[PDB]
């Protein structure tokens, strides 16, 4: 895929544990390439290294 997504909002809960970053950005917009505003976007991401 080639789509570029951009998310910007307010973070209320960040959590890091064993290279697992969890973000919950409240009222954030998802910019496809059509920007989708997500009030509650669960972000769970790990280390890619």
């Amino acid at each position: 895929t080639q789509s570029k997504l951009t998310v910007k909002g307010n973070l209320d809960t960040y959590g890091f544990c064993d290279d697992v970053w969890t973000f919950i950005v409240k009222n954030c917009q998802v910019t496809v390439e059509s920007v989708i505003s997500v009030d509650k976007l669960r972000i769970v991401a790990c280390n890619s290294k």
């Binding site: 998310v7 307010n10 989708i36 890619s48």
Partner: protein, 46 residues
């Protein structure tokens, strides 16, 4: 369910602002599915 399943490589914060770089993930948003190649997320913790 508005869940971003990706991998973070860069998050920089300056006392009030996030700059999160997410790479090679899959995002499902409200009866829609989206997968990106790069993701640049800048949250704001009050």
């Amino acid at each position: 369910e508005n869940l971003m399943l990706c991998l973070y490589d860069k998050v920089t914060r300056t006392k009030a602002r996030w700059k999160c770089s997410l790479k090679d993930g899959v995002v499902t948003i409200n009866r829609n599915d989206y997968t990106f190649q790069k993701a640049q997320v800048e949250a704001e913790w009050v």
